[PDB]
Amino acid sequence: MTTTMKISIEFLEPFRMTKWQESTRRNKNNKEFVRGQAFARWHRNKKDNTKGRPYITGTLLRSAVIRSAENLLTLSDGKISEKTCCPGKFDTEDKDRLLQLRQRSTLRWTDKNPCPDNAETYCPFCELLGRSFRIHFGNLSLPGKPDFDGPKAIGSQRVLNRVDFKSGKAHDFFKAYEVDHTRFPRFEGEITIDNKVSAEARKLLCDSLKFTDRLCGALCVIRFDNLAEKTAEQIISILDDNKKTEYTRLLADAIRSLRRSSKLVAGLPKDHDGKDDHYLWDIGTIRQILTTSADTKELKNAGKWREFCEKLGEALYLKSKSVLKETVVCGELVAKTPFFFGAIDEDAKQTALQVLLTPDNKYRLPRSAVRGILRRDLQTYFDSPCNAELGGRPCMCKTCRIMRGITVMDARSEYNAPPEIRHRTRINPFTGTVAEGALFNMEVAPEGIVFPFQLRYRGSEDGLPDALKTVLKWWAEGQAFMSGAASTGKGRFRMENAKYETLDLSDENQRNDYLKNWGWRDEKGLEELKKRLNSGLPEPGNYRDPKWHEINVSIEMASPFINGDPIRAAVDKRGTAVVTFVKYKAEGEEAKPVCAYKAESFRGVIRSAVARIHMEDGVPLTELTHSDCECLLCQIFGSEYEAGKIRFEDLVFESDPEPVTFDHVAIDRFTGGAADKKKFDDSPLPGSPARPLMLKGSFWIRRDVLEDEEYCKALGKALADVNNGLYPLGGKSAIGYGQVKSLGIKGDDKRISRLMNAVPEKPKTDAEVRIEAEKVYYPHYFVEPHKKVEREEKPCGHQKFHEGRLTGKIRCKLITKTPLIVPDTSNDDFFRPYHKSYAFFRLHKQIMIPGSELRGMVSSVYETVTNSCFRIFDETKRLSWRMDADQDFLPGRVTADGKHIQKFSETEEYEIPEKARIKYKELLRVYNNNPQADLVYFKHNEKYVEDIVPVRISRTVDDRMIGKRMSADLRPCHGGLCPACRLFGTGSYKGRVRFGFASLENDPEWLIPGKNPGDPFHGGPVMLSLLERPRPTWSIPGSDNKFKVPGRKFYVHHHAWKTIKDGNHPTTGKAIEQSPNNRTVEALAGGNSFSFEIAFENLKEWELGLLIHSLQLEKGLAHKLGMAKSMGFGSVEIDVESVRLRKDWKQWRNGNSEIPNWLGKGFAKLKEWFRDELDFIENLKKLLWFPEGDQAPRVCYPMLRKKDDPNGNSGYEELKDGEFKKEDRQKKLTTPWTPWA
RNA sequence: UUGAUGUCACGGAACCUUUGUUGUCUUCGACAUGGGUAA
Ligand SMILES: [Zn+2]
Ligand SMILES: [Zn+2]
Ligand SMILES: [Zn+2]
Ligand SMILES: [Zn+2]
């Protein structure tokens, strides 16, 4: 009868399945069909659509139970007392008809001859298998006969590889369908019986079923008995209405990043002023839509929220386009590093690579990866690469012999959360900028997750084997690099709390109980095993060292550190443009922000450092296509056709720092004020010499590489180069961030660390100016550049140090003459417990100057001393001019569209052009939005209209833009390059100089004593005047084309800080009254020393001389630096103290005596380009000339009305004649030190 | 819908290769007004 055993196969792993195939190709010839003879199959009731159920064939169960019977009869006794068994009568009538044949070898427990053909009850194994369609039948299927859309709907497809042991690159791969058991746990089937077999037959069937470990290709317990497309349309319609489609991908990334929880939408970043006009979240608005969607009653589940956000991001991205023993070893796999497993899918096109997430949004540890890693470890221990191929016969090598009885169980995590995302970019060596389209990201799991693990080895020897003992010892030590991206650094599992128990041998009592109780492989079975397991681990019988030696690193940084993360900047509470990289761990269902440095960035820096120094055959080794070759760099690091030998790891900080906000502003080189654009800000981590950041971490090296000679020589050379401060870490190195002091190496056994470890007087001035004792001098004057430039030579690359080039470091000292100010611009109420108050810069209670300000100060001097393009300039500004009553405007009206305007007689039509509309549009732009706050009139020549104005007299509008004034040569070079852009760099071309922060050498000084003479750590307040906007309209008198931009703007040096110190106006002599616009700040007394360093790379002989000349200038001339330079606050002079170069990785040289050759040869290059041009060089020296003794100039800004300041000051009302004219403003400001009075 | 006297798929790691890097001194002085005049 039908012994209907509804054998619920409670899988502990996702069982596998095959894609459906039509009956036409259902034959032995089909490769996919013959391959998929051991997995499940998808039955389709109707072929029009993919509706159906999964089915299971009973032949697979028959094969599995027959194999179990083979093993059990081999193990237990060899022969039963009641009846004697045989090895098994196996024969084929025809080989072709059989789809597959047992190509392995059976067991030989008995040598008794094959049974007679003509017999009925002659041995148990034969009478079970047949030869006497009446025993098994059987088809397992889903419970209740459900219906589903299809195999893709109920599960998913995953792809498996075959990695060669030697190279590492996979050769061939295949796909299969996997289905989880969390919602499909049970299966229902039946097994028949003739009611003829003996009791031992049923006993063999039952205990063989209990003994089976893997069925349907998975370890298991064989237990017998809308409203999103509309949202996407709304967002894309808002973007189309507001245009600016370039931000679609950025918005997609930002809105996909909000899948953590619904609480982050409320705390989205705000405007700089705290308003609600963010440039992305208020483009419409989108913020209101997000808030009211988050407040919806249905979208309260975290799962619903995250999947809705994912759907929105995905749709928006697409729119944008014999003695036998057993062992029960267990343990816990604590993850000490992020891990990644390839589960690439097609739905999430935004992210190329995705981790293997379970259907319940939890992480998975597939058995394939574990088995592959075990294969790698055992093969590299035995030193016998298994060169077997698919099919044939199972090779009898030691590795396969050991692995023919190894099983490992799948595991699942518990930290259910959306995985974080990590970016990656490529760098072009010849330009130092990201390549086109080299922007991609991969999704990575968090760190600090526990995975249960259980190993069941069914051996045939006494105890565990020595190879497996050594492998487990290595794993417990923490040498188990399991997950992928091991070259990057991801994946490192340490077996914690190892606790094993060698179960037994092929006995008849404890083995019988083990068989009786299902082998304790279920959850409760695992519990009552763990209650009796014994701690410890067996010792190795013959220990072998691992092939991966650990190296420690201790990097010390003495400056702020920054690592970019643009996507994370769109969700932080503060609206900062650039923020440091942050990683999240798993601290018990918590995500603490942990600051770290990207292992990818560190690996890239090391790779570039080792690449730049070596020389293969005269080529730089960077421009080589590589591909297939045997370079040293390829051999060490790896290429597309070979795995690497070095693995890096993330570096963390040995402190608890918190970010500090800095922000910069660009300055136009002609107006002297802010250039608008965007006040970009950054939040670099804090770091100072007093409390330097201690970066600590460790990377791994292969033992063969360490033992090799040339490889360790290359590594030592690269480490020495990094230690010499030539490859700063992090980003924004051109400002001063990411400077490195030292790099110690330990644990290398003294194999790599062994390789690594009269200033000429300045010249005298020659300029001469005549300062009067009564004349009043204007604050700022203009310097005119040359007509043309020398934008001819091609810039040098960054592939390798070429012959005749120079590289090193420069030390200098800065001493202030006049009072210096560097406001914080962070806290507005420091002195004031409305009015604004600021103090001097402070990082760690150690006052210093930022390096970017010095960068700008010296870059301006270089750009003016050698003619070059205006690097920062605004070329979109229309200038109006309020005209006077000297004109011939005619009346008219604008009502008839198409017919344009018409004339009037009292107090036959003219067409209007389209350009005239633009002038009217901008005319009513600050007419209403003034700071100090349809009948029309038109013009004509014969049929055109020149200008259109509302009122009888108003401001004439300029036709050509401001940018079309100066010559084409001086216009900015956005992308051969002018000499200034060659050195400091460009948006496309990286620079070749680096600056750094300043620091003190003596105790501080202050202009005024503090509120209480308690300590010198703080200064006192001083009242400033009113700082007011510049206006180019004064420099450009009118609309005539003859007027053009004169050049650059500079402030002369004078002594007016005395007047500001006490309550006297710089001009009218009155006291400064309290008001919301006035300013109060701190001040340092003149005479404070400072010190800072400059680095350089790949400089010509003449270029280096110019930079030193452009930096120090010469005694008697000083730069200008600080706040409120109009009133003469802050003058600094740079004095060189040491110049160092480098000749080789081992040898450095103090080239202190060679500077006269460079300085002398610097002017030689000037004669080559410009022969007789010296006025613009001489004019610069006149502007920066310092007031010597008893030559105090009088500098002030005159006011409007002469009646004001009755001392005799002439105001601007009557200054527009005699002294200044309409046609003399440009030339009057040409000569420096020209008194207006 | 499994078709019987043979399935080591417990015969296979989405594995390999790429620095969110570059370019910006928290800087700062001149007017604003529409008519007046006017048949
Ligand atoms: Zn037999
Ligand atoms: Zn083998
Ligand atoms: Zn190569
Ligand atoms: Zn240029």
Numbering used by the authors: 1 to 132, 146 to 238, 260 to 318, 328 to 364, 399 to 834, 843 to 918, 930 to 982, 988 to 1008, ...
The authors write:
For obtaining target RNA in the complex, we also obtained the structure using inactivated DiCas7-11-crRNA complex (DiCas7-11Inactive) by substituting the conserved catalytic residues, Cas7.2D429 and Cas7.3D654, with alanine to prevent cleavage of bound target RNA. However, the resulting complex did not reveal target RNA and exhibited no marked conformational changes to other structures.
